[PDB]
């Protein structure tokens, strides 16, 4: 939705992915039904019908990725980050997946001395790991800068 940077699309792409558990680009009422039951909720069949039909511009009946990207730019929370942090993250992230890893904080720390054990690398991860996948986001990376 052409206001979104490189790291947000990479966050929203896998965010689209764990909804879509059949390996395509279509959110039917089924897959959003499988999510909302796993949240412990009882999904109303009208509620499942409304939430798909509310954001579906093409009218096919399945939410694809550009419509999930359009919806998420509406319901974006906010971010007001810095130039120095964003340029730091794009150099730190090497393959460009939008994520710094445990394999990619070893490279940054070896770049400035700083002998870490592989345990202490993962001990750095879990402090910045707000949600949890064993990876630090861009939103979590900003959080570990402007804390002071």
């Amino acid at each position: 939705a052409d206001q979104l940077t490189e790291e947000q699309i990479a966050e929203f792409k896998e965010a689209f992915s764990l909804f879509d558990k059949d390996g395509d680009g279509t959110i039917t009422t089924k897959e959003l039904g499988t999510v909302m039951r796993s949240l412990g909720q009882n999904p109303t069949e009208a509620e499942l019908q409304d939430m798909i039909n509310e954001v579906d511009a093409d009218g096919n009946g399945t939410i694809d990725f550009p419509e999930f990207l359009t919806m998420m730019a509406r319901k974006m929370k906010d971010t007001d980050s810095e130039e120095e942090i964003r340029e730091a993250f794009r150099v730190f992230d090497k393959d460009g997946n939008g994520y710094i890893s445990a394999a990619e904080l070893r490279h940054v720390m070896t770049n400035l001395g700083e002998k870490l054990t592989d345990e202490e690398v993962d001990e750095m991860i879990r402090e910045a790991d707000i949600d949890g996948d064993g990876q630090v986001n861009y939103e979590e990376f900003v959080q570990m800068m402007t804390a002071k």
Binding site: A15, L39, M51, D95, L112
Partner: protein, 644 residues
């Protein structure tokens, strides 16, 4: 080197021709008042050129002047055509410049003037080279897809672009999106460009046509190391069979990954390319499970049978060198009687006893083994290459050379035995240290010995080679210094330095501290000697041999996750080699076939896994729909200080 000198002279000359022309300078800034005064004249040179062979419309499009460019199109509509005629920017039209500058009004104005959407920017400044900072393509659709403008791509298709535009490299539009430095936004365009295909029957859909190297867009992401594009192209090639709670069972398609491959398949492309970013595709979702099922099942047992045949081969060669024929010395000791100790020599008619008939069997095992090496290795060197890319396959490297040099030195010994030449000690004593140190090849199939044999190689071509240039500086200076000190004295009470070849071999050993050091304690040594040897032992033993341990110790923890990535790529290179050379009676093809399961003729590999259940993530995106610690936090401040 002189081309960049010539290219800089072109850009300064272009700025000269603009200032020395009243049309081009007025089209440069904006000067909409000045164009109406010039273009109303009779001969106002509308087809004027420059250093890049550009017109006034190329200038107005390059410096982003919408107002001046429309005046040029009104007074002369022929300038929408007629691209640049220089060698550098050959073929680049004015539509190309408006697209790269990502202008929306100037592109739509040019398309109303019947611009060519199928022109080719086939200059030397658009080709894929390390000299150029960009590789955008040749066509306007290729330019709009790489600067990430979805408005102009949709605009160019509606005015009749070609979705299958191929370059001089043969690359389509989808190949160029992979070669771009912004991986995430290339994925967004890749879905868009396939969406407008949708009628590409052609007996070739869209993303299956290769370039002039035979690479599809799927395999080009494999070679160039686009980890982001590789995971995006996996969405088409998997099928979720069933989801049983926190347990899914996907079904990957091994039709472009598995090296059954009469064509060139993806495991050969990754393992032979020189990039260090392509070896990260060996950890992805179908490829990591494919290699392990080849290596555990059929890769490791066949590699440990070749490790045991070769080990019994190099024992059979060793006992032919121990029991080799010798006779006592024939004529005399009379070579000058103070420096000769050899007392046996080589025999001519060796095979005349029953104990040598056993050895003749053992030598024919060796020589036949030396021919078989030169028939399975040399017809890959002279055939697949003219030795241009044989050196570093992955980093595996020397074991091609050590097995050729072994098979050469056995056959030199065959020649010297048949013609009964004198010195067979020289071709043998190479052939043993080349022979047994090639057993280190078979230490890549064991995790204990695997990553250690890589660190031996990364020191010899590195932290040991740069030490042996500054060792040969030192032991040429001191060995020529110690030689002239003991040159004027007695060479039997201390004879470490009597010849200059011997003085080089003493000081090589005194640098290594493997022999003791010249001391007699009965006769007065030269007074200059004790000064120049105490100078020597400080910068040999106290300084420079304690600076290898400080340098190899510094390197060993820096490349300590690279050598683990190098070992997992040595298994893939071994597995593909064992799969290719062995027959099809052994080594069954990987994955389950699909003939008797209603899936076609291709080959599948299913992987099931337990993923998670992460509540805090899934609850945050769900509402959006609606109608040990102490020294870790010390490390982040160390990163905040480094970032600042």
């Amino acid at each position: 080197e002189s081309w960049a000198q010539s290219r800089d002279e072109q850009n300064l000359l272009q700025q000269k021709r603009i200032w020395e022309s009243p049309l081009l300078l007025a089209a440069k800034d904006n000067d909409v008042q000045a164009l109406n005064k010039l273009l109303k004249y009779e001969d106002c040179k509308v087809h004027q050129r420059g250093a890049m062979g550009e017109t006034a419309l190329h200038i107005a499009a390059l410096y982003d002047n919408l107002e001046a460019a429309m005046v040029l199109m009104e007074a002369a509509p022929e300038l929408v055509f007629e691209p640049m005629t220089s060698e550098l920017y050959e073929g680049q039209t004015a539509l190309h410049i408006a697209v790269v500058n990502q202008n929306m009004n100037l592109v739509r104005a040019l398309l109303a003037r019947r611009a060519s959407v199928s022109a080719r920017a086939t200059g030397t400044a658009f080709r894929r080279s390390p000299c150029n900072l960009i590789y955008f393509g040749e066509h306007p659709l290729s330019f709009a897809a790489c600067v990430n403008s979805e408005e102009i791509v949709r605009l160019l298709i509606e005015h009749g672009a070609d979705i299958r535009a191929q370059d001089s490299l043969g690359n389509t539009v989808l190949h160029i999106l992979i070669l771009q430095p912004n991986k995430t936004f290339a994925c967004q365009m890749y879905n868009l460009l396939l969406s407008y295909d949708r009628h590409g029957d052609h007996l070739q859909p869209l993303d299956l046509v290769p370039n002039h190297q035979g690479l599809t867009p799927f395999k080009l992401a494999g070679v160039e190391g686009n980890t982001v594009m590789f995971q995006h192209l996996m969405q088409k090639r998997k099928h979720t069979q069933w989801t049983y709670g926190p347990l899914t069972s996907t079904l990957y398609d091994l039709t472009e990954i598995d090296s059954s491959g009469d064509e060139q398949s993806l495991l050969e492309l990754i393992i032979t390319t020189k990039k260090r970013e392509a070896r990260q595709i060996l950890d992805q979702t179908p490829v990591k499970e494919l290699v392990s099922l080849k290596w555990k099942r059929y890769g490791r047992p066949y590699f440990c049978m070749l490790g045991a045949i070769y080990l019994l081969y190099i024992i059979c060669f060793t006992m032919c060198c121990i029991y080799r024929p010798l006779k006592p010395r024939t004529n005399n000791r009379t070579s000058p009687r103070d420096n000769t100790l050899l007392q046996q020599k080589l025999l001519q008619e060796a095979y005349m006893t029953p104990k040598d008939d056993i050895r003749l069997v053992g030598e024919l095992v060796t020589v036949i083994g030396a021919i078989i090496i030169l028939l399975v290795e040399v017809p890959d060197i002279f055939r697949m290459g003219v030795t241009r890319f044989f050196g570093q396959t992955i980093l595996g490297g020397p074991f091609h050379v050590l097995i050729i040099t072994y098979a050469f030195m056995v056959l030199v010994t065959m020649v010297m035995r048949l013609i009964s030449a004198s010195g067979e000690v020289v071709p043998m004593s190479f052939a043993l240290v080349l022979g047994w140190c090639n057993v280190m090849y078979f230490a890549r199939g064991f995790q204990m010995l695997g990553p250690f044999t890589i660190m031996i190689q990364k020191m010899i071509f590195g932290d040991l080679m740069r030490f042996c240039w500054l060792m040969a500086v030192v032991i040429l200076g001191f060995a020529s210094a110690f030689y002239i000190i003991f040159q004027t004295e007695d060479p039997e009470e201390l004879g470490h330095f009597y010849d200059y070849p011997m003085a080089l071999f003493s000081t090589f050993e005194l640098f290594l501290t493997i022999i003791d050091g010249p001391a007699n304690y009965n006769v007065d040594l030269p007074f200059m000697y004790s000064i120049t040897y105490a100078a020597f032992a400080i910068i040999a033993t106290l300084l420079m041999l304690n600076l290898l341990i400080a340098m190899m110790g510094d390197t060993h923890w820096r490349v300590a996750h690279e050598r683990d990535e190098l070992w997992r790529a040595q298994i893939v290179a071994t597995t593909v080699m064992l799969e290719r050379k062995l027959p099809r009676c052994l080594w069954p093809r990987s994955g389950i076939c699909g003939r008797e399961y209603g899936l076609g003729d291709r080959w599948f590999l299913r992987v099931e896994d337990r993923q998670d259940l992460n509540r805090q993530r899934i609850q945050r995106y769900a509402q959006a729909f609606h109608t040990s610690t102490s020294r870790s936090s010390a490390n982040w401040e160390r990163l905040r200080q480094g970032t600042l």
